[PDB]
């Protein structure tokens, strides 16, 4: 208490990016025109989930170190509530100290989202067997988020930064093994007072 960490996170998109539309009405509206819609706000901005990527990043790296972390990727897997990932991003007993925001673009969908033609080529006749359309985020598009950590601890910005580097290497969103979602993260941290709004 008495301080709150604020991590101002700026994404620049290096490769193209795809995070699919989750809303059934928006997806079913766009699947008439494009077979892979992108996640988009109702104010026509691009929405990337960021808490799960930071969680998943830290779970893989801390399981690879050998430090005790639970797995919240396995199906219906109960969080332990004792590990550092449970302290940062949450368990079933205590909520997440890090309130990760959604990565929201600084620009509108008609400026950074393009519709693209993808294929499946027959390996033998070297000829298009399948053609789909997908919406991608252009390279250089800028996204912003605030990772607002209540009850600050010492190793809670660095692990986030560590997780950001993992998201720089592996990617964010979908189609991560076809090359989509390679990104760069620029960080600005500040220990804001918890009573800063009291005038």
């Amino acid at each position: 208490a008495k301080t709150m960490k604020k991590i101002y996170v700026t994404m620049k998109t290096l490769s193209p990016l795809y995070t699919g539309e989750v809303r059934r009405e928006d997806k079913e509206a766009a699947q008439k025109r494009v077979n892979f819609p992108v996640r988009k706000t109702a104010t026509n901005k691009v929405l990337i989930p960021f808490k799960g990527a930071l969680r998943s990043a830290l779970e893989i790296m801390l399981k690879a170190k050998g430090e005790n972390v639970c797995d919240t990727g396995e199906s219906r897997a109960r969080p332990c509530g004792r590990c550092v990932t449970c302290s940062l991003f949450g368990s079933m007993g205590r909520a997440g100290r890090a309130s990760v925001d959604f990565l929201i673009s600084n620009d509108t969908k008609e400026q950074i989202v393009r519709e693209s033609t993808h294929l499946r080529i027959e390996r033998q006749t070297k000829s298009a067997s399948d053609t789909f359309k997908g919406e991608e985020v252009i390279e250089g598009a800028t996204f912003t988020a605030t990772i607002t950590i209540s009850n600050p601890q010492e190793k809670d910005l660095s692990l986030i930064q560590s997780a950001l580097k993992f998201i720089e290497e592996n990617g964010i969103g979908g189609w991560l093994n076809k090359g989509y979602g390679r990104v760069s993260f620029e960080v600005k941290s500040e220990d804001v007072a918890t009573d800063r709004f009291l005038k």
Partner: protein, 556 residues
């Protein structure tokens, strides 16, 4: 509400759900331009009236700073602005001043660029924008932004009766204009060909400076009708590019001139620089070249051969701005003459007659540009017509279009937690009011009341069926015909005219060739069948075109 930003000029019209922009452009400091561009904010649309740099020059800067989502304009204004922006970037880089934008900003500005013709009503962000021709240059339109809190007519640069390529009477919203944004203004036509007669009979070359947009084509259309025996020659990559633009966009000109060639051959365009050096060494011809204000350009390699030759003349067929070499020798060992008859802007009278031909007198006429002196006498004459006018050196009613039910909502039930009523009615759009109206309405109004070729609906379906199975008409051809038909009807005429056009050199059209054992003559009858079939589909309404074309291309 409307904000007048203007260095740069712009008209932001904040409707309350969008930020629609009119004519972001700069005629002539880069930093105060950039700050003034930042002052606009994120705009949803950037509407271009005409393709002059006084109203289009800042459009790539707006896509540098990512302040615009869509740049709508006229299909000839777009093609013009391709050449216009590359020429402006050529001059800006060439002057060694730091470029205000880049060629990538030009490209990306044309990536989000949509194009509609005149009389085509778009509906973006709870608004209705419609273009109407105003006869300044080709693709020059006045803009009707029909909002809910007022209907606004941005006149742009209204044209003149001196124009010969564009139809004179400036098209105006047939309905009601609440607020009107007019631009205050800033018979020697026969004299041009006559003094060319006397000059070239005397043995000189008439070197007419002409602006590459509008002006040079007006001068050439003069010479290409007044049977000037001696040869006529345009000398300017950009001038000949806009000459091919006028010939390509011939359907967007005057109705008489929409039956074409338009320039009656006559001109022998000088393409390469070496040919211009040759013509400068050559000794009676009509050099309709283009540097504008006697600045850098294909004029100046010809300027010297007239400058020393008193027998030749140098006919100034344009306004000659200050700090230009042209005004310096306008205001010299050659004859200098000036013909203001070739003017693309109106005078004050034609602005008043553009303002007295609206259906209902505008509430406020915002004068914006022109000379500040002349804007006063225009203002005084239009206040004399009892019309409120807000000058741009100064800074109010609340018009609100409403929708009336006019149906009795008594007998009303709740089915799925919604209080609903199935109703049959006849919604009407009256000036200022949308009125839903019961059959009682149609009854009363019933008792009160009571080009393109032609083929039957079945003929059109049978022809597109045959040409689809002969593979002349394809799914991509039907897709782009639907795309150009969604921009208007003249764009579709220009599309099918371009595809059907036999090239005079190769005898090759752009139609997809047939499938089978057809012969040459029959192949040409199928190509003409395709041309007349799609041109017969242009006459039909958009909702009749769609169900015809969906049985061949399910996605367009």
């Amino acid at each position: 509400m409307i904000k007048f930003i203007g260095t740069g000029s712009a008209f932001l019209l904040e409707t309350g759900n969008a930020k629609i922009l009119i004519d972001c452009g700069i005629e002539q400091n880069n930093e105060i331009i950039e700050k003034k561009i930042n002052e606009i904010g994120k705009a949803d649309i950037c509407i271009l009236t005409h393709a002059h740099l006084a109203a289009s020059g800042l459009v790539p800067l707006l896509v540098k700073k990512r302040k615009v989502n869509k740049i709508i304009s006229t299909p000839a204004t777009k093609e013009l602005c391709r050449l216009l922006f590359n020429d402006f970037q050529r001059i800006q880089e060439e002057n060694n001043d730091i470029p205000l934008y880049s060629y990538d900003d030009i490209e990306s500005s044309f990536e989000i660029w949509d194009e509609i013709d005149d009389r085509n009503t778009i509906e973006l962000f709870d608004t209705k924008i419609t273009f109407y021709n105003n006869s300044h240059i080709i693709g020059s339109v006045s803009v009707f932004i029909e909002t809910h809190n007022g209907n606004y007519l941005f006149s742009g640069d209204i044209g003149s009766k001196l124009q010969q390529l564009m139809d004179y009477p400036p098209d105006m919203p047939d309905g009601n204009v609440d607020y009107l944004i007019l631009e205050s203004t800033y018979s020697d036509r026969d004299r041009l060909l006559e003094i060319a007669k006397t000059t070239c009979e005397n043995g000189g070359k008439v070197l007419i400076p002409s602006f590459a947009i509008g002006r040079l084509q007006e001068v050439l259309y003069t010479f290409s009708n007044y049977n000037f025996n001696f040869p006529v020659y345009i000398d300017s990559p950009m001038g000949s590019k806009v000459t091919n633009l006028i010939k390509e966009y011939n359907i967007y000109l005057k109705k008489k001139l929409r039956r074409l060639d338009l320039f009656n051959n006559k001109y022998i365009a000088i393409n390469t620089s070496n040919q211009s050096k040759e013509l400068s060494n050559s000794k009676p011809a009509v050099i309709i070249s283009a540097s504008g204000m006697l600045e850098g350009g294909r004029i100046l390699n010809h300027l010297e051969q007239i400058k020393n030759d008193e027998n030749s003349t140098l006919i100034f067929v344009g306004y000659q701005a200050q700090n230009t070499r042209g005004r310096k020798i306008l205001d010299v060992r050659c004859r200098i003459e000036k013909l203001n008859s070739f003017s693309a802007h109106a005078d004050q009278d034609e602005l008043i007659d553009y303002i007295e031909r609206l259906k209902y007198t505008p509430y406020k006429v915002f004068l914006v540009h022109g000379e500040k002196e002349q804007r006063e006498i225009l203002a005084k004459r239009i206040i004399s017509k009892k019309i409120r006018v807000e000058l741009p050196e100064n800074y109010e009613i609340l018009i609100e279009k409403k929708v009336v039910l006019n149906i009795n909502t008594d007998n009303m039930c709740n089915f799925a937690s919604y209080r609903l009523m199935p109703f049959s009615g006849f919604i009407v759009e009256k000036d200022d009011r949308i009125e839903i109206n019961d059959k009682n309405w149609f009854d009363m109004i019933w008792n009160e009341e009571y080009a393109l070729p032609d083929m039957s609906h079945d003929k059109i379906i049978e022809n597109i069926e045959y040409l689809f199975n002969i593979k002349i008409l394809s799914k991509n051809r039907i897709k782009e015909f639907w795309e150009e038909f969604c921009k208007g009807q003249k764009a579709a005429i220009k599309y099918i005219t371009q595809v059907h056009r036999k090239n005079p050199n190769t005898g090759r059209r752009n139609w997809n060739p047939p499938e089978g054992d057809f012969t040459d003559n029959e192949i040409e009858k199928l190509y003409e069948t395709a041309y007349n079939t799609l041109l017969s589909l242009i006459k039909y309404d958009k909702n009749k075109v769609y169900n015809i074309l969906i049985n061949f291309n399910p996605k367009l």
